[PDB]
Design goal:
304 residues, binds sodium ion, alpha+beta, binds ligand EYL, binds cobalt (II) ion, 21% strand, binds magnesium ion, hydrolase, 5 helices
Length: 304
Amino acid sequence: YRYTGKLRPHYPLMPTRPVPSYIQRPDYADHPLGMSESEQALKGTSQIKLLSSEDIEGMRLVCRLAREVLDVAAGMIKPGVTTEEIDHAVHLACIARNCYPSPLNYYNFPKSCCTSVNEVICHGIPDRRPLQEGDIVNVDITLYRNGYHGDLNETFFVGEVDDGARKLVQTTYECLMQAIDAVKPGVRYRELGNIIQKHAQANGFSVVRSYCGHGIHKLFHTAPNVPHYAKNKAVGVMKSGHVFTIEPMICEGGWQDETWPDGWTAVTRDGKRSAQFEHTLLVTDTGCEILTRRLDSARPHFMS
Ligand SMILES: O=C(NO)c1ccnc2c1ccn2Cc1ccccc1
Ligand SMILES: [Co+2]
Ligand SMILES: [Co+2]
Ligand SMILES: [Mg+2]
Ligand code: NA
């Protein structure tokens, strides 16, 4: 395998972390290939759940808890910290909040969060590599509580970064917020990729095509499919009571991705950097609520 950049996996991985049996588990947690029977059943349906009041309270709760866990991870980002140590802290933080860390054994993913450095687009596996000054790193969190999943991510700076890193991360965050600002009943899910790609291209960046936003609630990934690029053919119209993610991945060079031999880590084919942000959103009559927002600070972590 020809690595596309400088990054390499740093093995061994710490042995798999257990979740106490007192924590409710999603179906895939105990499936040997990590398959979700509930996702596979709804595979090939395009109908989007209208959440009940009970469902909405359950999503507010788990999305609030997932934000608290991302904020734990954000506190740790500095030179010399391993991504494995971030994952260990995340894993304990979930457990402390009576949540299952959704990524764990999702299609056999080995860890409790994804940590994506520099050319990694998404789904990076926490490992023994110490963060270096100049790195950008994304931490992607998803929790499962009382049957509901809540999903968010942010990209962070590792000490001082270059002007390129600042522009890439700022623009990706702007893409996400412009998409969110368009969300309201009656808007087609395919329109968000037009707004995202228009703002990436105006700043000289490309948009990953292989990974999309998703419906989320009782399932980790379900309808709708929400592409981040222009002129996609996503099916569906936003209705009050829909919940889904927007999670644009923006790249310095081309959009093309490939996967490491580990089967998970997605990287730019050209080895240039990619950044990502993600929120979980509830469509309301007036617009949108950001279920994974910060409650106690106006700005994402990179802004400070
Ligand atoms: O937080 C997440 N997204 O916002 C999240 C998303 C999608 N897939 C995930 C994670 C967790 C683990 N896998 C599963 C996987 C399956 C085949 C290839 C690569 C990864
Ligand atoms: Co996520
Ligand atoms: Co997601
Ligand atoms: Mg090394
Ligand atoms: Na990256």
